[PDB]
PDB file of all heavy atoms in Angstrom:
ATOM      1  N   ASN A   8     -59.112 -56.243  10.726  1.00  0.00           N
ATOM      2  CA  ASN A   8     -59.501 -57.596  10.503  1.00  0.00           C
ATOM      3  C   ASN A   8     -58.580 -58.612  11.157  1.00  0.00           C
ATOM      4  O   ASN A   8     -58.336 -59.685  10.610  1.00  0.00           O
ATOM      5  CB  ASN A   8     -59.756 -57.914   8.964  1.00  0.00           C
ATOM      6  CG  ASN A   8     -60.900 -57.112   8.433  1.00  0.00           C
ATOM      7  OD1 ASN A   8     -62.028 -57.374   8.730  1.00  0.00           O
ATOM      8  ND2 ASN A   8     -60.536 -56.171   7.583  1.00  0.00           N
ATOM      9  N   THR A  18     -56.948 -70.959  19.430  1.00  0.00           N
ATOM     10  CA  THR A  18     -57.864 -72.023  19.141  1.00  0.00           C
ATOM     11  C   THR A  18     -57.625 -72.718  17.776  1.00  0.00           C
ATOM     12  O   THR A  18     -56.794 -72.286  16.976  1.00  0.00           O
ATOM     13  CB  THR A  18     -59.324 -71.466  19.139  1.00  0.00           C
ATOM     14  OG1 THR A  18     -59.407 -70.568  18.008  1.00  0.00           O
ATOM     15  CG2 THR A  18     -59.640 -70.722  20.428  1.00  0.00           C
ATOM     16  N   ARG A  32     -42.341 -64.980  21.231  1.00  0.00           N
ATOM     17  CA  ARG A  32     -43.032 -63.832  21.889  1.00  0.00           C
ATOM     18  C   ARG A  32     -44.347 -64.248  22.590  1.00  0.00           C
ATOM     19  O   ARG A  32     -45.066 -63.445  23.119  1.00  0.00           O
ATOM     20  CB  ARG A  32     -43.421 -62.840  20.792  1.00  0.00           C
ATOM     21  CG  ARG A  32     -42.133 -62.215  20.161  1.00  0.00           C
ATOM     22  CD  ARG A  32     -42.418 -61.150  19.087  1.00  0.00           C
ATOM     23  NE  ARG A  32     -43.283 -60.086  19.561  1.00  0.00           N
ATOM     24  CZ  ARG A  32     -43.238 -58.812  19.012  1.00  0.00           C
ATOM     25  NH1 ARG A  32     -42.509 -58.586  17.868  1.00  0.00           N
ATOM     26  NH2 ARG A  32     -43.999 -57.850  19.516  1.00  0.00           N
ATOM     27  N   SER A  37     -54.590 -63.907  14.052  1.00  0.00           N
ATOM     28  CA  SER A  37     -55.513 -64.594  13.051  1.00  0.00           C
ATOM     29  C   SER A  37     -56.422 -63.544  12.393  1.00  0.00           C
ATOM     30  O   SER A  37     -56.568 -62.410  12.833  1.00  0.00           O
ATOM     31  CB  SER A  37     -56.300 -65.703  13.762  1.00  0.00           C
ATOM     32  OG  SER A  37     -57.163 -65.228  14.715  1.00  0.00           O
ATOM     33  N   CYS A  44     -62.725 -53.770  17.567  1.00  0.00           N
ATOM     34  CA  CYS A  44     -63.130 -52.686  18.489  1.00  0.00           C
ATOM     35  C   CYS A  44     -61.954 -51.943  19.039  1.00  0.00           C
ATOM     36  O   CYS A  44     -62.178 -50.828  19.567  1.00  0.00           O
ATOM     37  CB  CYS A  44     -63.983 -53.328  19.624  1.00  0.00           C
ATOM     38  SG  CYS A  44     -63.169 -54.608  20.581  1.00  0.00           S
ATOM     39  N   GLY A  55     -49.281 -47.707  32.782  1.00  0.00           N
ATOM     40  CA  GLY A  55     -50.567 -48.029  32.134  1.00  0.00           C
ATOM     41  C   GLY A  55     -51.435 -48.801  33.086  1.00  0.00           C
ATOM     42  O   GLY A  55     -51.164 -48.743  34.340  1.00  0.00           O
ATOM     43  N   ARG A  62     -59.068 -61.067  39.609  1.00  0.00           N
ATOM     44  CA  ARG A  62     -59.567 -60.162  40.571  1.00  0.00           C
ATOM     45  C   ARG A  62     -60.785 -59.451  40.041  1.00  0.00           C
ATOM     46  O   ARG A  62     -61.309 -58.525  40.731  1.00  0.00           O
ATOM     47  CB  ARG A  62     -58.469 -59.155  40.964  1.00  0.00           C
ATOM     48  CG  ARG A  62     -57.329 -59.874  41.736  1.00  0.00           C
ATOM     49  CD  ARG A  62     -57.746 -60.246  43.239  1.00  0.00           C
ATOM     50  NE  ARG A  62     -56.706 -60.896  43.955  1.00  0.00           N
ATOM     51  CZ  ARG A  62     -56.416 -62.187  43.932  1.00  0.00           C
ATOM     52  NH1 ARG A  62     -57.251 -62.987  43.287  1.00  0.00           N
ATOM     53  NH2 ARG A  62     -55.443 -62.655  44.635  1.00  0.00           N
ATOM     54  N   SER A  69     -46.260 -49.889  36.575  1.00  0.00           N
ATOM     55  CA  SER A  69     -45.070 -49.407  35.973  1.00  0.00           C
ATOM     56  C   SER A  69     -44.394 -50.631  35.410  1.00  0.00           C
ATOM     57  O   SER A  69     -44.294 -51.598  36.106  1.00  0.00           O
ATOM     58  CB  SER A  69     -44.141 -48.779  37.049  1.00  0.00           C
ATOM     59  OG  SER A  69     -44.763 -47.595  37.509  1.00  0.00           O
ATOM     60  N   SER A  71     -41.363 -52.567  32.638  1.00  0.00           N
ATOM     61  CA  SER A  71     -40.113 -52.451  31.912  1.00  0.00           C
ATOM     62  C   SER A  71     -40.223 -52.351  30.421  1.00  0.00           C
ATOM     63  O   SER A  71     -41.283 -52.738  29.865  1.00  0.00           O
ATOM     64  CB  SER A  71     -39.085 -53.592  32.367  1.00  0.00           C
ATOM     65  OG  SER A  71     -39.675 -54.785  31.903  1.00  0.00           O
ATOM     66  N   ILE A  76     -36.337 -62.117  28.208  1.00  0.00           N
ATOM     67  CA  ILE A  76     -36.488 -62.571  29.612  1.00  0.00           C
ATOM     68  C   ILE A  76     -36.602 -64.046  29.705  1.00  0.00           C
ATOM     69  O   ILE A  76     -37.380 -64.634  28.994  1.00  0.00           O
ATOM     70  CB  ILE A  76     -37.746 -61.850  30.296  1.00  0.00           C
ATOM     71  CG1 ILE A  76     -37.503 -60.368  30.247  1.00  0.00           C
ATOM     72  CG2 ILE A  76     -38.013 -62.397  31.724  1.00  0.00           C
ATOM     73  CD1 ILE A  76     -38.566 -59.504  30.835  1.00  0.00           C
ATOM     74  N   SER A  81     -43.106 -74.738  31.275  1.00  0.00           N
ATOM     75  CA  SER A  81     -44.510 -74.867  31.697  1.00  0.00           C
ATOM     76  C   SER A  81     -45.031 -76.102  30.833  1.00  0.00           C
ATOM     77  O   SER A  81     -44.303 -76.658  30.089  1.00  0.00           O
ATOM     78  CB  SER A  81     -45.282 -73.586  31.412  1.00  0.00           C
ATOM     79  OG  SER A  81     -45.401 -73.306  29.988  1.00  0.00           O
ATOM     80  N   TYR A  83     -46.841 -75.583  28.370  1.00  0.00           N
ATOM     81  CA  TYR A  83     -46.975 -74.967  27.070  1.00  0.00           C
ATOM     82  C   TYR A  83     -45.673 -74.725  26.319  1.00  0.00           C
ATOM     83  O   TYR A  83     -45.691 -74.735  25.102  1.00  0.00           O
ATOM     84  CB  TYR A  83     -47.741 -73.684  27.199  1.00  0.00           C
ATOM     85  CG  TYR A  83     -49.087 -73.790  27.711  1.00  0.00           C
ATOM     86  CD1 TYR A  83     -49.345 -73.611  29.135  1.00  0.00           C
ATOM     87  CD2 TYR A  83     -50.207 -74.207  26.965  1.00  0.00           C
ATOM     88  CE1 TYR A  83     -50.594 -73.719  29.646  1.00  0.00           C
ATOM     89  CE2 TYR A  83     -51.479 -74.251  27.510  1.00  0.00           C
ATOM     90  CZ  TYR A  83     -51.641 -74.045  28.864  1.00  0.00           C
ATOM     91  OH  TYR A  83     -52.954 -74.202  29.425  1.00  0.00           O
ATOM     92  N   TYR A  88     -35.976 -68.189  26.472  1.00  0.00           N
ATOM     93  CA  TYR A  88     -36.056 -66.771  26.582  1.00  0.00           C
ATOM     94  C   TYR A  88     -37.241 -66.186  25.775  1.00  0.00           C
ATOM     95  O   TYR A  88     -37.337 -66.613  24.592  1.00  0.00           O
ATOM     96  CB  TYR A  88     -34.814 -66.053  26.072  1.00  0.00           C
ATOM     97  CG  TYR A  88     -33.606 -66.312  27.022  1.00  0.00           C
ATOM     98  CD1 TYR A  88     -32.916 -67.455  26.905  1.00  0.00           C
ATOM     99  CD2 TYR A  88     -33.335 -65.435  28.070  1.00  0.00           C
ATOM    100  CE1 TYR A  88     -31.771 -67.755  27.795  1.00  0.00           C
ATOM    101  CE2 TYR A  88     -32.292 -65.701  28.929  1.00  0.00           C
ATOM    102  CZ  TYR A  88     -31.562 -66.849  28.814  1.00  0.00           C
ATOM    103  OH  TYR A  88     -30.491 -67.206  29.635  1.00  0.00           O
ATOM    104  N   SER A  90     -38.976 -63.080  24.058  1.00  0.00           N
ATOM    105  CA  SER A  90     -38.662 -61.729  23.611  1.00  0.00           C
ATOM    106  C   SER A  90     -39.835 -60.747  23.699  1.00  0.00           C
ATOM    107  O   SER A  90     -41.049 -61.165  23.721  1.00  0.00           O
ATOM    108  CB  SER A  90     -38.080 -61.784  22.209  1.00  0.00           C
ATOM    109  OG  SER A  90     -39.031 -62.215  21.287  1.00  0.00           O
ATOM    110  N   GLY A 113     -53.542 -46.108  23.666  1.00  0.00           N
ATOM    111  CA  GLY A 113     -54.296 -47.262  23.187  1.00  0.00           C
ATOM    112  C   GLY A 113     -53.733 -48.578  23.759  1.00  0.00           C
ATOM    113  O   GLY A 113     -53.117 -48.544  24.860  1.00  0.00           O
ATOM    114  N   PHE A 128     -46.091 -58.836  30.261  1.00  0.00           N
ATOM    115  CA  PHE A 128     -46.935 -58.471  29.150  1.00  0.00           C
ATOM    116  C   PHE A 128     -46.124 -58.586  27.861  1.00  0.00           C
ATOM    117  O   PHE A 128     -45.038 -58.142  27.737  1.00  0.00           O
ATOM    118  CB  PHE A 128     -47.387 -57.007  29.235  1.00  0.00           C
ATOM    119  CG  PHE A 128     -48.062 -56.624  30.552  1.00  0.00           C
ATOM    120  CD1 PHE A 128     -47.333 -56.011  31.588  1.00  0.00           C
ATOM    121  CD2 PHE A 128     -49.401 -56.910  30.775  1.00  0.00           C
ATOM    122  CE1 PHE A 128     -47.946 -55.644  32.741  1.00  0.00           C
ATOM    123  CE2 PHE A 128     -50.004 -56.606  31.994  1.00  0.00           C
ATOM    124  CZ  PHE A 128     -49.276 -55.931  32.975  1.00  0.00           C
TER     125      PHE A 128
END
Side-chain angles (χ1 to χ4, degrees):
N8 293 292
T18 68
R32 293 181 62 157
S37 61
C44 57
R62 294 286 179 272
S69 293
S71 66
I76 297 179
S81 68
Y83 302 92
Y88 289 85
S90 63
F128 307 101

